[PDB]
Amino acid sequence: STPIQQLLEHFLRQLQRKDPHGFFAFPVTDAIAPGYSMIIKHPMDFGTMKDKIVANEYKSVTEFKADFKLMCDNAMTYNRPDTVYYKLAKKILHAGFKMMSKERLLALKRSM
Amino acid sequence: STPIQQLLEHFLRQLQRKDPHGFFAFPVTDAIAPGYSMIIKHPMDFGTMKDKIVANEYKSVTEFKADFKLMCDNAMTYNRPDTVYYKLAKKILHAGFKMMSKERLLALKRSMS
Ligand SMILES: CCOC(=O)Nc1cc(-c2ccc(C)c(NS(C)(=O)=O)c2)nn2c(C)nnc12
């Protein structure tokens, strides 16, 4: 790996740790979630994010964060507020954005 | 746990792969190298650097690079130029400052958005 791949893999691992049951690990299928592919036109999941890291497709932590935000947003859009998926998405969106906050990235940038 | 620790571990693994015989793995003893402590007053080795990462004692990649350079510099100071230890220290020093150069660090710094 390159260093940037290492940093992204670290963040991804930290995020995945917040999803022990692997809800966000792979794309949501219509067989599990009726209408999903019509409601969510921009699907995303941690597997796809890993693959983009491996294929070296991310230029920046901002790009990585945007895919994470999309993933959580999709879950909060498709699922009703009282569901496990909505509540978990909400919790991890906020936690992940704190973990990768502008301030934390600035201190990391300083430490080089 | 933590981004800096992961990055330093990455650099450290890549450097240690260039020392297959493990000459730099642990502190050099006077038993191994006579008179070593009489000459080298600020010893360093990969083991100590690893412990420092794990204990999160490195606050910058600069602190890290300086320890690495000290390690190599010690080997070139104690051993003569036609020895395996001097030659390897020179080789790995060059390798490390290529890997952890300002150019390469700027590219990473930029990737932190
Ligand atoms: C006049 C003879 O001079 C020397 O023997 N010099 C040096 C010797 C070795 C060395 C040998 C054997 C072994 C097994 C190891 N590995 S270790 C320290 O973990 O036990 C290291 N490292 N070294 C380093 C660095 N810098 N100088 C030397």
Author numbering:
A (entry chain B): 138 to 249
B (entry chain A): 138 to 250
Question: What do the study's own words say?
Answer:
Bromodomains (BRDs) are acetyl-lysine–dependent protein interaction modules that play a pivotal role in chromatin biology and control of gene expression. Acetyl-lysine recognition is mediated by a binding cleft formed by four canonical helices (αZ, αA, αB, and αC) and two connecting loop regions (ZA and BC loops). This interaction site is highly druggable, enabling the development of potent protein interaction inhibitors. To address this issue, we developed a promiscuous BRD inhibitor [bromosporine (BSP)] that broadly targets BRDs (including BETs) with nanomolar affinity, creating a tool for the identification of cellular processes and diseases where BRDs have a regulatory function.
To ascertain the predicted promiscuous binding mode, we determined high-resolution crystal structures with different human BRDs. In all cases, BSP was resolved well in the high-resolution structures and inserted into the acetyl-lysine binding cavity of each BRD module. In all cases, BSP exhibited a common binding mode, whereby it engaged the conserved asparagine [N100 in BRD9, N140 in BRD4(1), and N1602 in TAF1L(2)] while extending its sulfonamide substituent toward the front of the ZA-loop binding cavity. The excellent shape complementarity with diverse acetyl-lysine binding sites explained its high binding potency, which we further characterized in solution by isothermal titration calorimetry (ITC). Although most BRD-containing proteins are expressed in HEK293 cells, we observed enriched binding to most high-affinity in vitro targets of BSP and also identified binding partners from larger complexes, such as the SWI/SNF BRD-containing proteins SMARCA2/SMARCA4 and PB1, which were most likely enriched as a result of a tight interaction with the BSP targets BRD7/BRD9 (22). We used a fluorescence recovery after photobleaching (FRAP) technique to disrupt the interaction of full-length green fluorescent protein (GFP)–tagged BRD4 or full-length GFP-tagged BRD9 with acetylated chromatin. In both cases, we observed displacement of proteins from chromatin, as evidenced by the fast recovery after bleaching. In the case of BRD9, we treated cells with the histone deacetylase inhibitor SAHA (suberoylanilide hydroxamic acid) to increase acetylation levels and to enhance binding.
